[PDB]
């Protein structure tokens, strides 16, 4: 597209992001190896608003990108995660969201959005990114037959659309998350996808702010593989490029022209998964492609980090009330602490893994 919400623009990098790589790298022994975890504060990644009390955060960051931008002369990007559906994650064993369905849940969502714009609202000189749910949208194309999502699927469509509609008023340039190529890039969930997203688009008024659709958020799949990762058998949209290369003419010919980013946060080593379902902090995984809007393709306006490499996916305790067995397969780094929480070892591996080398 001709607007690419990058270009000439600074990102800010997150200053906690930042706060937990300066902590975990003086952890690290090896000097060399250290210098290069250190350098990983210098990568921009997506803030999670995980919870209404992630927003003052957000405030702070507006202001102080404002700040940052007048010292430099530059114009600068604060990149955000809308985090927060009342039953969130629906097909999850278990869930971490403060909002449930049964307890005002749209209320309350809403007022989350709102408490966000209000923000955004006191700082249009900083420009805003945010993906849009990630684990949401994607449960209403192939998960209806899990109960709590098909109980959920209103409370997604409304909640989301309140999020695009109220985000456009003050010109947050959005992309829905939309899974990987493994979720919905098989050939049979292309169009029911993209008639879900253009359905959610349409409701939301079609706003041009709405530029599109996230890819691989908080996943492994490569971008481009020279080579197809074995959990890919029986789909030929084996890697990102292969799935967004299919989906984007079904959301062109809807009068959508989107447009997509990626996450490569976690995607420098292929080839490490049993099945490609396992998403909980995946042995071996290694800090991918650096963020860039050097895409390789006329659909992508740039990779991105999105999940920041070293938060854990969750707890490999099964003993915690938010425990989810999919982070004690064998394929899972173990032990691993709560999701969101810093997981050291994990960090570690991620920088001695790169790929490319940091």
């Known amino acids: 597209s001709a607007n690419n919400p990058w270009t000439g623009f600074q990102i800010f990098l997150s200053p906690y992001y930042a706060n937990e790589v300066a902590a ?11 210098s290069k975890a250190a350098s990983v504060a210098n990568i921009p990644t997506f803030t999670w608003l995980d919870s209404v009390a992630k927003i003052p955060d957000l405030g702070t960051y507006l202001a102080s990108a404002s700040a940052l931008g007048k010292s430099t002369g530059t114009k600068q990007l604060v990149q955000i995660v809308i985090y927060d559906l009342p039953d969130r994650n629906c097909a999850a064993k278990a869930s971490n969201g403060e909002f449930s369905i049964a307890n005002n849940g749209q209320a309350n969502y809403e007022n989350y959005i709102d408490q966000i714009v209000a923000q955004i609202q006191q700082f249009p000189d900083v420009r805003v990114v945010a993906v849009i749910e990630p684990d949401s949208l994607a449960n209403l194309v192939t998960n209806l037959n899990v109960q709590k999502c098909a109980n959920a699927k209103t409370t997604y469509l409304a909640s989301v659309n309140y999020a695009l509609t109220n985000l456009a008023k003050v010109g947050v340039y959005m992309y829905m998350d939309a899974g990987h190529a493994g979720w919905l890039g ?105 963020p860039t809007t050097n895409t390789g393709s006329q659909f992508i306006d740039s990779i991105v980090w999105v999940k920041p490499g070293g938060e854990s996916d969750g707890t490999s305790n ?18 691993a602490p709560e999701a969101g929480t810093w997981f050291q070892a994990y960090f570690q591996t991620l920088v001695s893994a790169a790929n490319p080398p940091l």
């Open 24 to 34: 975990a790298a003086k952890q690290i022994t090896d000097p060399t190896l250290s």
């Open 186 to 290: 098989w050939p049979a969930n292309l169009s029911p996808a993209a008639q879900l997203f253009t359905q959610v688009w349409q409701n939301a008024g079609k706003s041009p702010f709405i530029k599109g659709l996230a890819t691989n958020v908080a996943n492994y799949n490569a971008l481009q593989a020279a080579s197809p990762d074995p959990i890919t058998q029986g789909n030929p949209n084996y890697d990102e490029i292969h799935y967004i290369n299919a989906l984007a003419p079904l959301l062109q010919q809807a009068g959508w022209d989107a447009t997509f980013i990626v996450d490569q946060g976690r995607s420098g080593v292929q080839n490490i998964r049993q099945q490609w379902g396992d998403w909980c902090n995946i042995k071996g995984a290694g800090f991918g492609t650096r």
């Open 318 to 335: 099964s003993s915690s009330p938010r425990y989810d067995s999919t982070c004690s397969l064998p394929d899972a780094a173990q032990p």
